[PDB]
Amino acid sequence: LEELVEAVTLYLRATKNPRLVSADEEHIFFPVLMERLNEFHVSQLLDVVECHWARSTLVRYGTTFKDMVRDRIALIATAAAKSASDLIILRAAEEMSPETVLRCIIVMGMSAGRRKRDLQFFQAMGMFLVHHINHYKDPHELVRVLTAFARAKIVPPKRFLALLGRRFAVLNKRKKLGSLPSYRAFVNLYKMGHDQMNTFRFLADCILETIDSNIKAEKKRLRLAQLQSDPHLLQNLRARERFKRLTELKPSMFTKLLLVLARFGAPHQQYLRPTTVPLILPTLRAFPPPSFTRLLRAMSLFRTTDLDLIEPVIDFMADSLGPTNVVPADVLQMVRLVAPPDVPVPRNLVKLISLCEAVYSSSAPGDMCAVAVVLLKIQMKDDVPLEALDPLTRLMEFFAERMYLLMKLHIVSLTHVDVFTDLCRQQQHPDVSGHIERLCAERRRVNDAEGDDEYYSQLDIDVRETLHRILIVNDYNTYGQYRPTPGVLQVDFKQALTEVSAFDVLEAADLFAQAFSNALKPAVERHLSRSIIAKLDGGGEEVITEGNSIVLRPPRELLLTREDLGKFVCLLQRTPLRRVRASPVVWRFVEEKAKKLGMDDVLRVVENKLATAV
Amino acid sequence: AKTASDIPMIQLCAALKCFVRGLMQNVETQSLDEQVEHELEKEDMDAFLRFCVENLRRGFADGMEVKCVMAATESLYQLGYTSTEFYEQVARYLGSKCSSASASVNSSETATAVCLALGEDILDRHPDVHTFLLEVEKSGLKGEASLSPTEWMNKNDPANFITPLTEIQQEGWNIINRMVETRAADTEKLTALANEYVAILKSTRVDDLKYFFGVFEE
């Protein structure tokens, strides 16, 4: 037994290098061990299991090995339970030990996935861990157990997680739990649907006590010392290092913790006020824009009304970020944050208004509607001078003219126009330019002449949905191209483009170009160009089915009439897609269709475009 | 501090009195290290006191009795809140209520301590508040400073139903319930039950009479 155990452990530890994985040796060893594992103790089996497993070795012999040892461990544990109520079953009580259960959880948790046998086995060891929980004294082992369960994608019973949290509470005195393991446990418990708020309260307390202890330690060091008695990039790095030293966590994860606490309804006084001065303020400059947005939404949900935090953030955004660099979403979130009447008025509201004007005038629907609502909320306050609202009046007139343009294009929904008109009516706005009156007259003509039905029949629903999805992908919070667009969003956009014909997509792209100039991202333009090229190439399109299998769908026969193809040529001329405009395949297909239909001017244009391309 | 939302002013004052009464004993401080820790705890205490004065300002906004503001200022000075702006608001509020107040209801010891707590410059700016505090401390109530926080809450604000009932109070409530269940026509049983109630009226809650009289109405 000992010789075979040593040999198999030596081979398993030698299999760390992929060059040392051999088929002959594994074929010699694994079945011989397979037939004799009924003579092996649970400790020996776990020692064999714990050694490193090669991927090929795991797929060829590892999975069945683990399943059989799991079955044997379940059998010996059942025998031990019956006793409490190859001679190994006779001594099953001693073999099944709490340390054995803990190491089994740690090892098989990170090695198993979403399987039925794994689920049953894990439920068995969870019941046995409930039986032997009280013996463990290091909460880090429980944290590792929770992480293993999270990897396994299996949710134990709620009472089990409550017991684990109570054990965390009990064991924390003897051995304090670190802030990073506390964060990991918090994420795991939130992901596995643990509703009980007490564990979240305890974990937040465990994080905050460590943070304030470190802050007090540095302050007492400074006080004892005094009793005895690119530069921007460098400052950002130093601030990040200080924050990581104090909180033992990256700023993004701290901000997402704060956002989670805000979502769960925790008070702002006990979780933002203590950390505002030492943590948030000095590290604010080095935050990534995603962390900026998360923190802004955290303050919004927390209903924070402390100018001590509000004013420096506005000062940083106005003087250290610049209007061109700050995403308008964060600016809108800040304006909503200062909107509520209970929020005291900061002394630098004019800076925020000027930044809003600069950002929303340099760039060039529902967004304008919400902007108008929050401007109304700001104007409701009596501490706002009229002259400071004078630029906001011009902003609202700009929005009115933009709606004047959108109503002519039959793109904007009339409900948003009604909401905007109601806003201007309840604001008693001084419509000096009169564009609001012209908008109301055009809305009256819409309601009287054609109606909403004819207005919505002016265009195609497919084009509208393609435009909406294109705008959503383009307006996704990439935070100034800081983060690449998600692969899941890429797949969703590709699926949306696949189900829609090329002509509708081109019409949507032309409408987007007309409405917004130079507002299309390079990635979305490349995606649209690839979709159109694949559609018109004749080689088919790659579609990801419900089984996640790539299938070559043949291109749909676009039955284009003479007028329809002339419109297609016009859209090709007016599209912002340079690749599509210069694509020889599209022009060749248009030439073929023109030859089949028999028009001469389109043929001449296609010939000239092909000559220029070649 | 965590579970403090929509705090009645009386309950906040009672909690402040409890915090004051549980203050640590003062000993000679080692000037090297542990006095630094003393200041380190003092700043946290001051932050908690700032959280408290937030609700104090809220209570000023909605409206509070003079007894509540006097007790809150007493406790805040005893713990230590040297802002000199909140005290200006306190003096302003007392000046607002100076005419519509009675010196025969407030506490003399509280008046002396709050007059000491409020700076002489603040009283110089507000003379009517100074006269009112002088009148209260010269003529008022004595003995309300040594009362336990629960006794202070009960005497100051009845109908709180926070502390558990004693045996005599529970017996009185049982008598009230049995009177309620009894029919109106049966005058003898009601007379007997009322006579039983008034035999222990001294040891029962004063506010509970509002229920007792109600039976006579129903």
Binding site: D195 | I176, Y211
Partner: peptide, 30 residues
């Protein structure tokens, strides 16, 4: 709000402030 966890607290407590905002006459009696 999940953080409340089925605890009305001071808004649903027995304090005199909450007991002084109703006009029933206290006739039937609790």
């Amino acid at each position: 709000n999940p953080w409340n966890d089925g605890d009305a607290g001071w808004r649903g407590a027995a304090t005199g402030a909450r007991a002084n905002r109703g006009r029933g006459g206290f006739r039937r009696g609790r």
